[PDB]
Ligand binder design. Structure first.
Ligand SMILES: [Mg+2]
Ligand SMILES: [Zn+2]
Ligand SMILES: [Zn+2]
Ligand SMILES: [Zn+2]
Ligand SMILES: [Zn+2]
Ligand SMILES: [Zn+2]
Lengths: 131, 505
RNA sequence: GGGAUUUUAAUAGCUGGCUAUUAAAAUCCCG
């Protein structure tokens, strides 16, 4: 019964995230200590001629970015735990996330460690110019 | 990499996968979106939102090693080090039905303290906007073995209340024993899946009101506290887990427990399973392999009890040796052969199961040595024999008295933790059928430098008088004897004992 | 209903052999 979803290699860390008081610090400590990052993310095939905004309803990657499914790069969606956002809604799910090409080793860690700009809707430090 | 696990399984009945922007994993994407290079394409076909898919929680593995984070799935030796925190843990479950199929939810949680909690069937449901931990349709396990679980489907409570009840019960049990909690499970998979509902883990924390280790977590206060200050807390923080099946046991729990125990016979209930699990763990660690070199730190008054035991013994053995003119003594059970009292001039002989000194011989008592040891008094101090002979002084711990240093054990026995872990067999009153209870009395031969007693054996009381010296001595002996008796030790003597023989000295 | 081991079949891939996925069967444990 049912259909399998996740590899056995990731089950070591997500379980940890399912039990910790604060999951973001747990995942960042696991990755920074030398653990393997999350794999099995939904990476999309794009023409790479997008506007390069962080979160979009359609793939909008530039030549220096990669487009991922929104639910695949959210730690709370991968581990199936409660979101910390207002009203429990996910800001990634149902959308597409543009991750810089030099940070594709760990998209989940990039989404946890970074936030988009409130004005230009780009990643802060990776395209945002509001100075 | 390639091996797929049953954790986070999609237990929905839908025949198709999810959209690339909604699927959590590449495996869960529907195959219409995938391409040859392990990439998904964004087709123009509209998504099937909204949805609600039940996600399985079976398959947790807490084997990740992170610096600063403790190891919660502990091995055998450190579980023996943490024996005061042993709480048995069993969970009976209900299968998901109707909207879902392919996962189990907890239905009745049982603990070794004899407490059962019935919960509503609650699982994880993934929706287009996120996920929720709410109630799902469930069914009892089919079969005549689980007919008792059918009423429990209509008796559960909400999980947040049961969380606080569990934390309160654990705090009431483990307040004086330890700063930790060790869940002793038989099959740790479903037990860990159910423990995900009421346990939080992380770095080791200090209690917010004292210096003790924090064992409970409060989500509304976001605070950590020990067992004393965990009023209103809803989560168990950093519990230890022990799997008894991984210790080399073949078969089910019932046939393994019933092989060495006969006390915990009971109807099929999760608390009974947990009690049998903890009893089997106790048998595995303190009866199968004893004398493990582990010392346990003191808690309340064990040093004073150790002093008072010798204070009582040096009085009772001396009086027994003086009465009856017994000139030969066999101290069966003496590890080193050190005599109790050396003031009377009598012959001394020493025996033990594992003698530490060449002065002590090897001996085991099976009532066939009753005529063998018939020419002298027999000391049995903390010596466990199924039947004691007619000419003997006996001190035996009563396992029915439960204390901080006396944990429940196996087959009616008790784990006495006094700088060492000893498994004492169950106190049987028929073992002293040739013996009598030793009456209270004091003997003294010291010189002299309100009280009235008809049992004080002293030349002062023999003449019908008393002084401050013996009025204080008798009272400190009363304090020591009280402490020994209220601890749980019972003293027995040969049948013909009376203090009237002691006036000759 | 969940998991572990073994065996078989199909699919997919790689280099006579090997792995993975799915399905079926047997044994054992949990429910
Ligand atoms: Mg059970
Ligand atoms: Zn999310
Ligand atoms: Zn900006
Ligand atoms: Zn405290
Ligand atoms: Zn038992
Ligand atoms: Zn006197």
């Amino acid at each position: 019964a049912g259909s399998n979803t996740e590899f056995a290699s990731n089950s070591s860390v997500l379980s940890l995230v399912n039990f910790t008081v604060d999951p973001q610090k747990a995942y960042l400590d696991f990755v920074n200590a030398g653990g393997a990052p999350l794999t099995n993310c939904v990476k999309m095939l794009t023409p790479k001629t997008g506007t390069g905004i962080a979160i979009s309803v359609k793939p909008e990657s530039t030549a220096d970015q990669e487009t991922y499914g929104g639910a695949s790069v959210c730690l709370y969606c991968r581990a199936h735990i409660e979101h910390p956002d207002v009203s429990g809604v996910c800001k990634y799910k149902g959308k597409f996330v543009q991750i810089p090409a030099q940070c594709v080793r760990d998209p989940v860690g990039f989404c946890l460690s970074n936030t988009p700009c409130n004005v230009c809707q780009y990643w802060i430090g990776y395209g945002c110019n509001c100075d | 990499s390639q091996i797929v696990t049953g954790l986070f399984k999609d237990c929905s009945r839908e025949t198709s996968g999810l959209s690339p922007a909604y699927a959590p994993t590449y495996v869960s994407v529907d195959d219409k979106y995938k391409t040859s290079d392990e990439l998904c394409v964004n087709l123009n076909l509209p998504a099937n939102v909204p949805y609600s898919r039940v996600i399985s929680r079976m398959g947790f593995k807490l084997d990740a090693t992170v610096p600063g984070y403790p190891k919660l799935f502990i091995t055998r030796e450190e579980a023996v080090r943490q024996v005061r925190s042993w709480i048995g843990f069993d969970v009976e479950g209900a299968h998901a039905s109707r909207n879902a199929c392919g996962t189990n939810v907890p239905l009745q949680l049982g603990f070794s303290t004899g407490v059962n909690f019935v919960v509503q069937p609650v699982g994880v449901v993934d929706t287009e906007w996120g996920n929720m931990l709410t109630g799902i349709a469930a069914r009892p396990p089919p079969g005549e073995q689980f007919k008792h679980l059918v009423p429990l489907m209509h008796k559960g409570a909400a999980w947040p209340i049961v969380r606080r009840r569990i934390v309160q019960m654990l705090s009431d049990t483990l307040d004086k024993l330890s700063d930790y909690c060790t869940f002793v499970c038989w099959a740790h998979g479903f037990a860990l899946t159910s423990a995900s509902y009421f346990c939080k883990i992380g770095k080791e924390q200090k209690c917010c009101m004292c210096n003790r280790r924090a064992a409970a977590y409060s989500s509304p206060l976001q605070s950590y506290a020990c067992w004393t200050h965990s009023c209103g807390y809803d989560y168990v923080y950093n519990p230890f887990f022990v799997d008894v099946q991984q210790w080399g046991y073949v078969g089910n729990l019932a046939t393994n427990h019933d092989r060495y125990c006969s006390v915990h016979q009971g109807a099929h209930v999760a608390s009974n399973d947990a009690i049998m699990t903890r009893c089997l763990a106790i048998h595995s660690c303190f009866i199968e392999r004893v004398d493990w070199d582990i010392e346990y730190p003191y808690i309340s008054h064990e040093k004073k009890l150790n002093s008072c035991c010798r204070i009582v013994e040096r009085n009772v053995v001396r009086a027994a040796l003086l009465a009856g003119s017994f000139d030969k003594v066999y101290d069966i059970g003496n590890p080193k052969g050190i005599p109790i009292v050396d003031d009377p001039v009598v012959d001394w002989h020493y025996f033990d199961a594992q003698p530490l000194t060449r002065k002590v011989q090897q001996l085991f008592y099976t009532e066939d040595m009753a005529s063998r040891f018939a020419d002298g008094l027999c000391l049995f101090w903390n010596c466990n024999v199924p039947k004691y002979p007619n000419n003997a002084i006996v001190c035996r711990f009563d396992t029915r008295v439960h204390s901080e240093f006396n944990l429940p054990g196996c087959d009616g026995g008790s784990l006495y933790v006094n700088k060492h872990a000893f498994h004492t067999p169950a106190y049987d009153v028929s073992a002293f059928r040739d013996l009598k209870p030793l009456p209270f009395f004091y003997y003294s031969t010291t010189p002299c430098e309100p009280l009235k007693s008809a049992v004080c054996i002293t030349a002062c009381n023999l003449g019908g008088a008393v002084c401050r010296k013996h009025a204080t001595e008798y009272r400190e002996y009363m304090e020591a004897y009280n402490l020994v008796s209220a601890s749980g030790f019972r003293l027995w003597c040969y049948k013909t004992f009376d203090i009237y023989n002691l006036w000759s000295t």
